[PDB]
Structure formats: C-alpha cells, structure tokens
DNA sequence: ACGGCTCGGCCCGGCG
DNA sequence: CGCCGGGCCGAGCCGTGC
C-alpha cells in the first residue's frame, strides 16, 4: 500500500514516471528502506531480499547494533527510502524538547 | 511479579525447567534464546516466534527463536505412557492427551 | 560462522494465545492450567500469591482514588476539583460525569475471590481480600442500600465462612 | 503498523469544525467555518493569500507572511529579512503564524480537482499543530493517503513497527 | 511468638479507696443516629453515575447551608445579598456574600478569590493593606467565609473585611461541681506492632490500679472516673506495602482479642469510650459510624466499654467533649507555611476557627459520598481531643481546650524516613469541672 | 437418534428467546412424555421452568431419556432465522451435534455443537399464597411500561374485588386500578389484604413477549415471592418466580 | 558515536552560576530535560564527565552545596521512586550524600512532574517540584554505571575522581 | 377545580409534541372560552401561539381564569402512552396536582406536579405581510426534506401566480416551482414580488409531523419574519412566527 | 506499569 | 414511520505507614 501511494503521488502530484511498479509483495525485493530506533536521530539503509511468515524483523546483528538496539524485546520502525525522501520535513517537527527524537536527520550509507 | 495472563514456565534453578546448552544458532546469539517448536506448541501456544521472556541466569530478558536440532519436552499422557516429543507434527498430534509435562526442553544460550 | 543449525527459520506458532483471550478470568484460568501442567512451577499458592499482588494494587488504588477525584463535563473537557452545586456544567447545559466509576473498583473482585477460595494462600492475603470486599460494601452504604432480596443464599462464598469460624 | 493516538491521515489543523474525530470532509460538507493558527503564504505578483505553497492562479511560489503579535502588520519574507524579524512600529519579535479563519469547502474541492480523487468518505486531521512554524501539509497528500489506506507520523512519514531478531 | 496478653491481670490495690461519685454522662452526638435518607433518581431508569454526583452536590449544599447558619449569629454581619442577584445592586452600598472558597492566588496587589455559592460564582479581591490580610492568608479551600465590600460592574467584588465562623468571645461560666472528677485521654495504641510499647502500657495500667508514689497522684487516681480513646487502637492489616514484616500479630481477629485482653484490666469503676481510626477495621472514609462488629466483637463484649463514632460528642457533668481522630491536621500542616507536626496544637485551632474537621476535598483525607455533612462543628465544645500525629500538645483558644493525646508506639521506619519524632507514653489528665489539663503523666521511662 | 417435528417455528423461537432473556446456559431434560427445562439466573433472584408434552408436538419420536446442553445465544440466533409458517425439526445422531432444520419453501440444516452444563436441582416448595388473579397480557404489559416511567419498582395491592398496581416516584405517581366489573381481570380470589413490591427490570424482562389474547395468572402473598403463569398451546405451562423488594 | 539524541535534546542548556552562599565563586551547571531520561546509563555518566572536563579546562571552580541542597536531593530521590517510577535502581541515602558532596558541577534541570516538595526556596534552585531529568542522571549514571565510568577515567587520563574509584 | 374531557388522546399527544419541540417550560391558561398557550423559544427566534377554544372538548367546564405550569417533557411522556381510542381527561382539584386520567379498557391515572413559571405577555398585532399563500402540508414537507440535503438555509420566493422554493450550496442546488394549476397550490394573493430566507432546522421542526390533507397558510415579507398557521379540528389553531436568518 | 478496563454519545440497520 | 439495539469512536484511570 505504501508503494502504491508513492506511485500515485509521483504520477498525479509531481507528473513523473512511477518507481516501484509492484502488484505483489514479492516485487519489492531489491528496494531500499530506512531503519530507525525510538531513541535516536540517525537512520541506516537496508535492502529487502525475502519474506517470512512470522511477526519479527530479521536482520544482521550489525544492522541492529548500528541502531543502538539490543534485540531482547526491542522494537524499531521501517520505512521506504523514497517515501521518506519525498515526505520528510523539518518544519513538521514539534517545538518542545523531544520533537527531534525519532527523526531521520541523517542516514548512514555504509 | 506475575501479571495475570502471563504464565511462569519455571522456578529458579529447578530441575525439570530449561536445560542449558552452550551454542549459537543461525538466527540467535545477540541476546536471544533457541527453543524447540514442540515446547512452544505444548505450553498452549503462549510462546510464539519473537515472544519475550524474563530470564534468570545470563541476563534479564530474551527473545525465542525456533531451533529444530535441540531436544524437546518429555510428556506424560493421560493413559500413563511417557513420550519424548522432539518433533513439531508429533506435538500437534499428541497435544490433546497431555496430562503432565515432565521436562520442558532445551535453551541454546551463546 | 555458527554452532547450531535449524531446518526452518519461521517454523512454529506465529501468534501468542494471550492475544486471543478476552476476559481476565479466562486469562487467569488458562495461565493456571498451564502452570499446573508444568512439573517445575508449583502454582498451588505461589502463582496465586504472586498474582494477587497485581489485582490487590488495582483494587486498593482505585478505592483510594475514588474518594479524591475530579469531575468533568461531557460536552467540554474542563475538569472541576469539586462537584458543582447545580450538578451541571456552569458554562454548559451538559451533565457532569465521574473520572473513577464505581464499576472500575470491583472489576477484579470476582477473580480475586476465586483465587482466594480455589487455592491455599497465606491467611494475610485472604483476610486482606475479605476486608477489601467489606470496605467496598461499607463505603456505599447510604447511596446504594440493599433493597432487593434473593431466593437462595450461601453461594459457596468464603468470607462468611471465615467469619463464622 | 504505527498510528497516532487519534489516527491522522494529513497534518492539517481542523480545530472543532471536524467534530470529535477531526474529520475534515465532514466539516467541508456541512459548510462550517473554522478558526485555527496556520501559516499563510502570499504571491508576490498577484497577491493571493492562503495556506498554500503554490499560487493557483499563476503557479508561482509564494512567500511566508510574518505578523506582529500585538500589532497586526503583515510583512513578507523578503521585507521581514531586512527588519531582523522585528516589528518596526513596535518592539516585539515577529511570528510566522496567527489565528485565522478558513473554509474547508473551497480547499477540499480544489484538492479533489487537483488529484482527481473524489470518492473519499473520511479525511482526518489534527486539532492543532505542535511546531513553531505551524506550516500545514498539502491536502492532496492526505487524499492520496486516505485512498490507499495509509497513515502518517509526527514528521510526515509512514512507519511500521516490528520486534527485531538476528 | 504469638502471645496476645492473655495472662495480663492487674488487681486493684486494697490501700486506696475510691470516692463514691454518681456517673453523670450522656452521648450527645453519634454518626449512626442521624437517619440519612438515600436519594431518589430524577426518573425511573437511572444508573450509578448520576446518584454519586447528586449525593456529593447535596453534601456540599448541606455544608454551605449549615456554615451560613452558623455565620449569621454575630451582630456584625448584616445586609446579606445573593451572589446571583449582584448585578442588580448599587455601587455605594455595604453588602456581604457568604460562599465556598474555590481557589485563591497571590499577586503584588493582594489576594484573589473565587467565592461560589448556590447562585453562581464571583471573583473577590482583598487589598494587602487590610487588617484581616494576615488572618485570610492562612485559609484553605472548600471552607465557608463571609466578605464585606463594594461590588464593581467591571467584574470584581472589591472587599475590605474578612470573616470566619469563629468562636464567640464571651461565654457564661457553668455552675461549680460538688466533688472533683477526672478524665484520662489515650490514642494511637497500635496493638499488634513490633514498635508497640507494651511495658509502658502495662505500667500505666498498674498506675490506674493504685500503684502510685506521690500522695497527690494517689488522690488523682482515687478521683479517676472516665477514660477516652481516640482511635488507632490496632495496627491493622495491609495498611501499607511491606507491613507484613512489621507485625507481631498478623491477624486482625487476634489483634482485637489482644487489645480486649489488655483493656480488661481497667477498674470496674471507670467508663471507657472507644472510637475507630484510620488503621482499624472500619469505614474507609470519614465519618466512620463504628467498628465492623464481626471483627471488633471482643472489644464490643467488654463490660464497661462504650463504642462511639468518629466524630462524636460526649457530655460529662454538663461538659461537652468533641472527640475525633484528627486526619484533617495534615491538610492544615501541608498548606499553611510555618506549621509542623511537632506542634499540632495550632492546626487544631485553625480547624476550630473554620468550624470544620476536614474541609479540603481531594487532598490527603478521604470523604464519603454522604447526602448530609456531619463533619461541621454545630455546637461549641468545652474540650477537643485529637490524635493521628503521635506528638503531644495542649493550648487554649478563647476558653476551649485543644488537647492531642500522644501515641503508644515507638518511632518506626516511616517516621524516621520523613523526620518525625514521636513522644510515646504521655497521658493528659483533665478536670471535669475546669475542663482543663491539670497534669501530664510520663511513662516513657520503660518505653 | 430421536426425531422432533414442530409446527410454527416462530413460536418456538419466541419461547426460547423469552427463556434466554434471563439465563445464559441451560440443559433440556427430554423424556418419552416430553421435554422440560429449568434453571436460575446468576443473581439468584428469578427461576424459570418450562415443559412441553407430546400433545403439542405434531410428531414425537424419542428413545429413552437424554440430557442435552446447548449455548442459548447460538440457539436463539439460529431460531431467529426461521419464519412464521416453516416447520421446525430437531434431530441428533450418534455424534454430539444438534441438527436444527427448517422446512418451508426450502430445507436448511444447521449444525450446532453440544456443550456440557452442570445440572443442579433447585425447587422452591409450594408456599402459602394469600392472593390469586387472572388478567390479560396487554394490561399488565402497559402497566409495566407506565410504571417504568416514574420509578424502578412496582407495588401490588390485593383486596376483595379490587386489584390495584401502583408505582411512586420522587414527585410523580401512576396508579392502575381495576375490578371484577372491568375487562382486564377475569377473576380474583384473595383471603386477606396483600402488599408487595417487585423490580421493574425483571418484570419488564419477563412480561415482554406475551400475546395480547393471553391469560396470565399471578400468585403472590405478603412480603413473599410471586409466581406468574401463562399457558402455551393449552397444554404447556410457564413458571416465573421473583423475589420481592425491601 | 553520534547516533542517539542525548547531545541534541538531553542537554537543555548550559549556564555559568555563582556560589554566592559559600564564597561567591564561579561554577558550571547542566540543565537536563525530559528526553535525557531515555538515553541509557552510559550517556548520562559521560555527560557528567565531559561537563567536569570542560569546567576544569575553562578555569572555573567547583560546586559547594549547602546542607539544604543535600536534604532536597535525598527527599527528591525518595519521592520520585514512591510516586512516579521504580527507578530501576535504589541508591541508599548515604550514596546520594557522597555523590552530591563529590561532584564538581551542579546537576539540575527544569520540572517534569506535578508533585511539590518539602524543602522549598532552596537558593540557586528556581522550582519547587520534582526534577526528573537530573535525579535520574544521578541515580542511573555516575552511580549505577560507576565501573564503566572509572574504566573511562583510567583510559582517558582524567584525575580528580578518586572518590568514585574508592 | 375544572374537569376537561377529550377524545382521541393521540391527536392531543401530537399537538403537545409539536408544541414541545421548541420550548421546555411554559404556562397554560384555562378559561371558559377555552385553553390558550403562548411560549417562547430560548433562542428568541421562533414564536409559538396555540389556542384551544372550549367547543372542541366533549365535556368542558371551568369557572374563572386559572394558569397552569407544567414541564413539557413529563407531559409529553404521559400523553404518549395514550392510544388511538382512549379518552383523555384533565382534572384538577383543590390540591396543587394535575391529574391526567386515561379511560379505556383499563383506567390508568397519572399525577403531575405543577411548577411556577413566569409569563411574558407580548401580543403582536397584524403586520404588513406582502404575500399570503395557502398550500398543503405534504408539499412544504417534501420541499423542506429536499432542501435539507443541499444546505441549511431555505429561500422563499413569491411572485405573480408563482411560488418558488430554492436552496443553494457550494456545488449542489434544488428548486421547487408551484403554480395555480397544481393541486398543492389552492390559492395565492400577492401585491408585489417578495423574497426572504430562513433556517432549515427551525423550518424542519415546525413542518415535521404535519398532516397530509391540511391547508397551511403562509405569510411573509421582505427580510421579515414568516407567519405559518394551520387549523386543527376546524376549531383550534396553531400560529408560528419564525424570524428570518440574516 | 501501561495496555487493558469502564463509561457516554452517535449513526445505521432492521423490524414491526 | 417510529423505535431498539448494536458497533464504533473517544474520554479517563490503574498499593503507600505522619
Ligand atoms: Mg534492550
Ligand atoms: Mg491515624
Ligand atoms: Mg496513626
Ligand atoms: Zn461544559
Ligand atoms: Zn499568484
Ligand atoms: Zn507591530
């Protein structure tokens, strides 16, 4: 659904060619995401290669360590890279202390 | 403390609880345990892939992951027979006749 | 590298049973059968006493907060530290509702009484539960008097049995 | 998936016109007028005013309006830059927002005509914005989110939460 | 270790002969004596959520009406006008308003109030240069006060005088008594606790039986007739988390049995009046009609024990005694600055001046949803007794004594944590005729 | 392996619903003569029993006696799917399932599981009733509906040739008075003046679902429970026992 | 490593204060906001260490609290556990006194809880309510993570922290 | 001490319910010629006058003029219990109680407490109304129901032998045109073209529950309050005065 | 320790 | 044509000694 929304946004709002062109979840393989922890301000880029029938997020221990997570009950968020690139803005962040937590202010590429 | 609805699987360092095995599976090692799916099935499916549990010896908290090479529970049936359920389909077939869980199974800790 | 191997990475139950139980009584009962099945748990009193320190805090905390609570208008969200003398919102025609209802106090009393009667706990917890029920009954003496009789008495309750002993 | 405490599909303030659920479409269809604090942008050429980044008449990027708190003089961004974001006639720092009245009917009709999305039943917004800028979001994005059944977060992203395993 | 004072027997000394005196006494107020008619729903299909609100509103209405009737006694207050019909008055007239204090704040000019009554709310300002500013500063909300001043059509009621229900300055002395009679006050025994000072209590019980050194104390003992206990006679069950390790007797039945066995040793010529407290098996919120009978039966069965309520008023030889536990002192201590638990006699005077025993709603005291307020001091007493503080004090304010009997429980972990120094084993001795404290016994040597 | 055929499934659905209005679980005792039911609501305030002999059943065939337990919610939900003219059929094979079938313009069979419920014998012995009255369903129904307007309780007063039922509120009052010369009452037999009071909720729950052309008999005494009866198809009988107030 | 937002949002502000009651010297105070409450034990202790190093490198004196400050801190530590959260750690009062006496900077902050204190109008402290950010730093920082802190001190060539080593 | 007997309690219930949709508290005056009524909407925008002369009532007797003050909600709840063929009796005695008795198959009596309410007597004489028209209830009912969809304000236009109702919105629009040849338009009398607008909510309240075969008189002017009146039983009548919006 | 538990209001379908 | 009743939605709240 997120990819369909992104394609509709690209075709109807900006007038640009569609990007994902996916009809099933197996068509998202090879596309990039961003992983962010609920207490940090930097994200990391990951790639999709497969799916499982469980309710967990499998990844390398380096991937979970790079988000300062311990992997003993923690939970993190994932978002498509292009959706975040188009949609994120620093003018929607709350003004009180704590509005910059959970924000991709910078992303690591390696 | 025990919250209503959240079971307690073993008493501190009590024989018959979780058997300690030293090792690391394909999908475990950071802070997670390795558990046979048979002992997930035979505890009324209160344990699922990714369910957290508060541990005693190594740390405080872990996530369970299926390992099919370690041993499973030993159960006592309603007619008096004693069986070793190291398989998943066998547990599914036998679940309804279980009178007492003699042994709980193994846990692989890194 | 790795030490142990597994046939499948997503083999086994996929959803916890805790998410498929609605009532608190059903949750407690299922958890207690689970604890009874396992040989190395010793539910019979241990799980009750440890579990009773999750319902007793709720009961006593709700009972305490009932007598010092703030009221609010349904139409607005303005809160009043003291009930209005007119019974209605001064800046509305809307009616005043409580923030701690009477049914939010005694929602776990049935399960607590079941846990007390079906298992052997220390006399301290049993007396605490009996006194909690007595206090709940006594706080609402002049507001909700007992005006309805019943056909049969003695529903196998434990408080009167302890008192008569 | 992740949703706010009241679910939100567009970061647009509605106040009380939308009801308990902050439904923008219901307020638009009932002809209600709402007063909220937002940022208004002004077209340098023709002088359009409203909470839009692009002028519908000519398609030329507008500029943010700065307003005095006590005094009520509006200064565009280019002029407010010279004034150091302080009112000349007063001695109080300027602000990019003020309490203003909006009519959801015209805005929603323009958005629907813009993205060609008409059959949407609900469109939830916020009671008020939390930033210091109070810059709103385009309503076309909210319509496309409502059409595809996806939600939004505090920074304008769609997120999915899951337990992590190695 | 489960001894419950089963074999604690003290016999009267056959050396001191008590003087024959006719016990003239009668209970003047009891909570389980006013018949509170429960409320009727506005229609035939009501629910629980509305009756409670209506009962609370009725309670506050009754409080306001009773305190207004008390206020309209002094000749100085006159020309009362309703708050609702205040816009229909001139700007050059002397008017008064009586209502409940919603909230108060402080500014450079003075104090701003939100006095409210049955017919709407109004804002009242009092200048800092007023003569009653000091008195009105240390007032806590939900009390009933009277104001005097000029009402402005702008929206502020400017005032120049402050009033409280107070106590009359002049009173008529009572006729003298024929023979002298004495009374003893006790509170906060806390039977069943590890910190309960049992040896001092036993020594005091022997003192009541004639084991006395000085001749004047012999005469006082021979003249003792009445004894009053102001609650907290047992340590309770489940008062706070972690109490199980603090209890020698972890059984409420056994606690009351031990207390009855202790109190059975009083002489047969003394009448005991016992009231409940915040640790006993009784109603969670004040007023408490009595103990739970099925738990306090061993103390109900005593030959000369009389069970009273909280609060209750007793009339011994024409002298009125107002007996309460004293949970309302905490509100005065925590509001007014400069007041501590080490000197509880001043918050007692504050409560007496405001003529209510627990005004603040939503603080440190629980208030029951009764349709009638029984915590208003309707009549002026001769003596006032309180406990719950574990510190002794005694002052006199305009002819009424304000005692605070000490505890019988040594300092425990909590009072050590929060810096309170108890004074256990102190017992006031009062004179019935004078209605004043004439001596203080101190049995703290053993405890 | 017993076959049951019932004409007018709507009536059966209505009686099942009026039995379900108070209790949630019950067990049916069916013998060669007929089928019977009896249980009590968890508040221990009301008692309902029901009998259905072989005469009213158009086709009866049963071997021995069997105790069956059915979820009353699912039972009434299935029964509500019938029509006014279809014939209701109840069958049970060797499996522990109840086969509920309806035969109108088409035949539909519902499979519904059997449940086990503990059966407790609870019979209150016949008590000395000082008054009896026979009235129509319509009059008592409207009287209950009016009494629910002012108060949550309704008061009965019995006297020779005078049967009055009232309810007082805080300010308002409603009184229903009628005699032998009126229409709603058929006959009245009292031995002494009688007075009682009963909750509005229970009375409204029990009288709801009665036909206008029906005869209901009320037996009650002084500060003692009340019994309400009404014949079903001239052969059955319904017993309601309600505790009084005060 | 520049990942978690403790530097960005944990540290509310930095100010230079004067030790008027004792000697009228110059010291440094760190204001801790709400978000520092979720940064982990290691981030807070390193923040205190960095504050100490910067105050020593800027030619500033050390904090010299009065007794009232100590009593206020002990009652705040006692109160927050009783009324807000389990603290995940319970320092003894003597440990609190030792830490307050031997820390060269003032660990303070704004008010985050709607609870009033007993020791009021303490000089230098502008609030009469619980300061959750600072007390959590003290409890779960230099105290709970003392071993890692002394290891960092040894690796870092920092003196003046012998009391923590003892 | 008056005794008033009325037939067809349903019609009285409808009349009171129509009178109860704008006001909650008002006073009833009773006099030899009949019963009057004049209440005021709390919003001070719609005026209602109701007059019930004595000839309509079957047995109407009273001496002098008295005032009666009753809350409308309780009264509407009491009268809503009446059926199609129940006799409605209004009786008052020395005691300050209003007795409403429903005579039928069972004599059920209700008692209501009188409440003191202030009376503001403002008699409005004939105003210069540009247009006076008479239409059936169904036509105006359907017109209002159609106009409720598009917007919340309804426009009236009266021209020479023409009656047009219109409502406008952001994008939608509905119009209704009435001519003499139409059955709904019985007659029309206008001196010059007039136009004004009103609110749908008040209009819906005044026209809802209007009989199909009723001739309704409409009078209004340029930006002036509208006058609506329809006769009941050919003897009693109700007058509505709705102030225009903007 | 915080998602789970009570209330109240507001439309939307049947249903008679 | 007018109710009865469900099913959503949104508010609030969760041990404690003087
Ligand atoms: Mg972790
Ligand atoms: Mg006490
Ligand atoms: Mg005490
Ligand atoms: Zn309101
Ligand atoms: Zn432009
Ligand atoms: Zn300006």
Residue numbers in the entry:
A (entry chain B): 885 to 994
B (entry chain B): 333 to 442
C (entry chain B): 1051 to 1215
D (entry chain B): 664 to 829
E (entry chain A): 173 to 619
F (entry chain C), H (entry chain E): 2 to 247
G (entry chain B): 112 to 277
Quote the study on this structure.
Family D replicative DNA polymerases (PolD), found exclusively in Archaea, contain an unusual RNA polymerase-like catalytic core, and a unique Mre11-like proofreading active site. Most Archaea, including the emerging Asgard superphylum, encode an unusual heterodimeric D-family DNA polymerase (PolD), composed of two subunits: DP1, the small subunit, contains a Mre11-like PDE fold and carries the exonuclease activity, and DP2, the large subunit, contains a double-Ψ-β-barrel fold and carries the polymerase activity. A catalytically inactive exonuclease variant of P. abyssi PolD was chosen (H451ADP1) to prevent active digestion of DNA substrates (hereafter named PolDexo-). Proliferating Cell Nuclear Antigen (PCNA, the DNA sliding Clamp) was added to stabilize the PolD/DNA complex.
Two primer/template (P/T) DNA duplexes containing mismatches were designed to trap the polymerase in the proofreading mode. The first P/T construct contained three consecutive thymine mismatches at the 3′-end of the primer, while the second substrate contained a single G:A mismatch at the −2 position of the primer. For each substrate, cryo-EM structures of the complete PolD holoenzyme (DP1:DP2) along with PCNA were determined in the act of DNA proofreading with resolutions varying from 2.9 to 3 Å. From this heterogenous population of particles, we isolated a closed conformation of the claw, referred to as the PolD-Exo complex in subsequent discussions, where the 3′ terminal nucleotide of the primer is within the exonuclease active site. While the template strand points toward the polymerase active site, the four terminal nucleotides of the melted primer are shuttled toward the DP1 nuclease active site, located 45 Å away from the pol site. Importantly, the four terminal bases of the melted primer are shuttled through the exo channel, with the terminal nucleotide present within the exonuclease active site. As expected, but now structurally observed, the active site of DP1 contains two metal ions coordinated by four histidine residues (H362DP1, H497DP1, H560DP1, and H562DP1), two aspartate residues (D360DP1 and D404DP1), and one asparagine residue (N450DP1). Two Mg2+ ions were modeled in the exonuclease site of PolD-Exo, as the cryo-EM structure was determined in the presence of MgCl2. The terminal nucleotide of the ssDNA substrate, which is located within the exonuclease active site, is present as a pre-catalytic complex, with the scissile bond positioned between the two Mg2+ ions. The ribose moiety of the nucleotide to be cleaved is stabilized through a hydrogen bond between the 3′OH group of the sugar and the carbonyl of the main chain of residue H560DP1.
